[PDB]
Amino acid sequence: SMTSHSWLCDGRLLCLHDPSNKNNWKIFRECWKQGQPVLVSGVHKKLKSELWKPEAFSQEFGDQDVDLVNCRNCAIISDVKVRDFWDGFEIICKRLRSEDGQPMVLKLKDWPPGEDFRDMMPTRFEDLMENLPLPEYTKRDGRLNLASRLPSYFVRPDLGPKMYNAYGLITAEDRRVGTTNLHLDVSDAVNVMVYVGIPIGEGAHDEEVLKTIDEGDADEVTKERIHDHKEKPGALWHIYAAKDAEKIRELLRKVGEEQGQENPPDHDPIHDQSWYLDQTLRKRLYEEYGVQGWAIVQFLGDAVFIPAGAPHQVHNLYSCIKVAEDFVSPEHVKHCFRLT
Ligand SMILES: COc1ccc(C(=O)NCC(N)=O)cc1
Ligand SMILES: [Cl-]
Ligand SMILES: [Cl-]
Ligand SMILES: [Cl-]
Ligand SMILES: [Cl-]
Ligand SMILES: [Mn+2]
């Protein structure tokens, strides 16, 4: 029946069911003040779906010059046309190929660039901003968003939103690699999955997705969203509490040294954004440091709320279009303060 909310991660993650429900703040407040991430489903049903297709991005902006990253080896592909990315989004045989002759898993880097989203795409901006959940926290002029209200003693976020576009990771070896490596942000963020592209040509890649989710350490209720409701899964997230950041640094310093890296003892492997925590490193983090995270599968229309200071990483299961907005909640303002 109509339910206001449910729990995922064996009770540890709030999942709100109606993104426009004026009472969401009452349940959200409590979980958010404890430094938890939150998931809101059903945002895709609020959007104009014709504005968020790969084909329309290709047609309208195809001639713009961009760089891409090879997600498998971190190689940068320099000064190509953005249509070279979009036209292989879903059709595998159209994708740029590596020396080995295999179609590459690519991320479109920094597009639209800097703070240009609103200028380049005024109709998309309107469609997203008008349908963000928890609007008092997430809108530019929201009463509980301090972004526009803080003095220079605070690190203020850029004007957004930002778009995150990348292919899905495919093989058994791709399971140990990230779309976005482990990092943290000094402000809060909401990340919405506006489109999930399920590719064709090698269109029998269903079972590898399920083994990645399973090995990802995803909860039984999350697996029921696929098998029962036939929802489209986009990305596997791992998020850790802000207060566990330094323990994670201690693990990654030790593993670095083990792997022959020669780093100063105070260097910051989270700020380096060079690590993905695979099943081996997540197990080790649990056993040797007593740190546990949230394994979150972001489906089409799912909004992921990321607390300020929380280390997080992303692994695309299929090809994803994501749009993210920064904000500064009073709950977490400490994380962007320039003193002590
Ligand atoms: C910050 O400490 C914790 C401790 C435990 C969890 C948890 O139950 N995770 C389950 C899952 N499937 O991801 C989340 C956070
Ligand atoms: Cl906090
Ligand atoms: Cl537009
Ligand atoms: Cl609100
Ligand atoms: Cl990255
Ligand atoms: Mn981020």
Side-chain angles (χ1 to χ4, degrees), residues 1-21 23-47 49-58 60-98 100-142 144-155 157-333 335-340:
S1 335
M2 199 242 99
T3 54
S4 65
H5 63 274
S6 53
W7 305 93
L8 292 168
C9 300
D10 309 318
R12 298 298 309 249
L13 179 68
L14 176 62
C15 176
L16 290 160
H17 291 169
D18 178 17
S20 57
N21 187 328
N23 300 275
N24 278 345
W25 68 269
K26 295 173 191 183
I27 332 172
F28 176 83
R29 186 136 133 294
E30 172 105 344
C31 299
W32 194 240
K33 108 208 154 210
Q34 285 182 64
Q36 298 171 12
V38 176
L39 193 150
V40 184
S41 54
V43 180
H44 61 304
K45 296 173 183 169
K46 298 293 188 190
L47 298 174
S49 60
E50 67 273 8
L51 292 170
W52 306 102
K53 295 184 154 293
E55 304 82 10
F57 290 116
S58 194
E60 295 175 39
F61 311 110
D63 282 323
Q64 295 183 25
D65 307 295
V66 295
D67 301 339
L68 319 173
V69 194
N70 175 344
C71 289
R72 285 199 178 117
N73 63 25
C74 291
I76 297 171
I77 289 98
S78 288
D79 200 35
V80 295
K81 294 288 170 186
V82 75
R83 78 162 51 81
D84 299 0
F85 171 82
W86 285 118
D87 287 1
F89 193 81
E90 276 157 332
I91 306 163
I92 293 183
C93 62
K94 281 194 168 188
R95 287 175 180 191
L96 300 182
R97 304 203 165 248
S98 54
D100 74 343
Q102 285 291 114
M104 281 186 301
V105 182
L106 301 163
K107 168 157 76 167
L108 178 52
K109 143 151 19 162
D110 185 16
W111 188 83
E115 310 181 318
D116 295 356
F117 186 106
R118 183 179 191 158
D119 281 325
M120 194 180 291
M121 308 186 173
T123 312
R124 267 100 175 172
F125 183 86
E126 183 171 42
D127 199 47
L128 177 91
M129 288 313 220
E130 282 298 310
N131 294 290
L132 280 181
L134 281 306
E136 289 210 313
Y137 289 98
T138 59
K139 287 169 74 75
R140 287 180 169 186
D141 55 342
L144 293 185
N145 188 3
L146 306 189
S148 66
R149 295 207 190 83
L150 290 177
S152 293
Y153 293 91
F154 301 84
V155 180
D158 291 325
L159 295 138
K162 280 300 272 172
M163 201 171 178
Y164 296 93
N165 307 298
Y167 301 171
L169 278 151
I170 297 165
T171 70
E173 289 187 31
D174 293 337
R175 211 159 284 153
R176 307 187 56 269
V177 151
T179 304
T180 305
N181 282 345
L182 189 79
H183 70 290
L184 68 80
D185 297 297
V186 295
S187 71
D188 300 312
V190 54
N191 182 300
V192 189
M193 184 75 74
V194 298
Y195 189 95
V196 178
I198 295 175
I200 31 162
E202 281 139 48
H205 168 267
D206 206 331
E207 271 133 63
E208 27 254 279
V209 161
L210 295 169
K211 179 49 207 272
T212 298
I213 290 167
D214 180 37
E215 192 191 307
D217 302 305
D219 67 86
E220 292 302 321
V221 179
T222 292
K223 288 163 179 178
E224 296 188 336
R225 281 182 88 176
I226 297 191
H227 293 108
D228 300 359
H229 303 288
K230 323 298 182 180
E231 291 192 83
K232 283 173 169 169
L236 176 58
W237 294 66
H238 296 98
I239 308 185
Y240 303 82
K243 75 186 208 316
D244 289 321
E246 184 59 30
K247 292 302 164 190
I248 292 161
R249 292 186 192 101
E250 290 170 357
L251 169 66
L252 293 184
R253 281 180 203 126
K254 172 172 62 160
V255 175
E257 173 168 34
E258 283 171 358
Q259 275 177 10
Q261 294 189 15
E262 201 55 81
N263 297 120
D266 75 317
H267 115 280
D268 189 348
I270 291 179
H271 184 262
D272 286 353
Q273 196 157 164
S274 65
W275 290 94
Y276 183 78
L277 308 171
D278 65 350
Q279 187 171 58
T280 296
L281 290 180
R282 292 189 311 268
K283 184 75 191 303
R284 191 158 167 192
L285 178 60
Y286 185 94
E287 299 285 308
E288 289 172 24
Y289 296 85
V291 171
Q292 189 171 10
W294 291 269
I296 304 178
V297 177
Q298 182 184 23
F299 292 73
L300 176 64
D302 282 358
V304 177
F305 284 75
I306 308 108
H312 57 284
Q313 64 183 25
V314 191
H315 174 109
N316 285 9
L317 304 161
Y318 292 116
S319 302
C320 296
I321 311 183
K322 308 189 196 86
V323 182
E325 179 68 9
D326 285 349
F327 66 97
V328 189
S329 69
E331 289 86 345
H332 302 142
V333 76
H335 293 281
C336 72
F337 188 54
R338 288 188 187 270
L339 289 166
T340 95

